[PDB]
C-alpha cells in the first residue's frame, strides 16, 4: 500500500526539526463510522479503545530549505476518512495529536506538542513505502 500525500506538519523536538507527512491510502480501513456528535464526546471516555487506525512509517531523513538535515515521518489514514477530516479543523487537530502521540511512543521520545501546518507543501519526503 503506497500512500498518497495529504498534508504536512512542521514541528520541533529539542534536537531539531520534525515534519509529519499525513497521507492516506484507500486500504486501511477507517474507524467507520461516526459523526461529529458522537466522537467530539467519546474522547472524554470510550478509550481504550481507541480507534483511528493509522500506520506510522519509519523515520527518513531529508534536507530542509537552508540545507540542514531533519527528520520526516509518514502517517497514513483511510482515504474516505481523510476527506471527512479535510473540511473540519477539530478532527484535523485530533488526527495530528494522535499522530504525534503514537509516534512518541513507537520511536521515543520527546516531540513538540505545539505545531504548525504547512500551506503549499503536502509532503517532505518521497514518499514511502510501505507495509503491503
Amino acid at each position: 500500500i503506497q500512500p498518497k500525500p495529504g498534508f504536512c506538519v512542521k514541528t520541533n523536538s529539542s534536537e531539531g526539526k520534525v515534519f509529519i507527512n499525513i497521507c492516506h491510502s484507500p486500504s486501511i480501513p477507517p474507524p467507520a463510522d461516526v459523526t461529529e456528535d458522537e466522537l467530539l464526546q467519546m474522547l472524554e471516555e470510550d478509550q481504550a479503545g481507541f480507534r483511528i487506525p493509522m500506520s506510522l512509517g519509519e523515520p527518513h531523513a531529508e534536507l530542509d530549505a537552508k540545507g540542514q538535515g531533519c527528520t520526516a515521518y509518514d502517517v497514513a489514514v483511510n482515504s474516505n476518512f481523510y476527506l471527512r477530516m479535510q473540511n473540519s479543523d477539530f478532527l484535523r487537530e485530533l488526527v495530528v495529536t494522535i499522530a504525534r502521540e503514537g509516534l512518541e511512543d513507537k520511536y521515543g521520545l520527546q516531540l513538540n506538542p505545539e505545531w504548525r501546518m504547512l500551506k503549499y507543501r503536502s509532503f517532505l519526503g518521497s514518499i514511502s513505502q510501505q507495509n503491503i
Partner: peptide
C-alpha cells in the same frame, strides 16, 4: 507571512 519550509 509564511513558514521557512514552503514553496512578515
Amino acid at each position: 507571512e509564511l513558514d521557512s519550509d514552503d514553496e512578515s
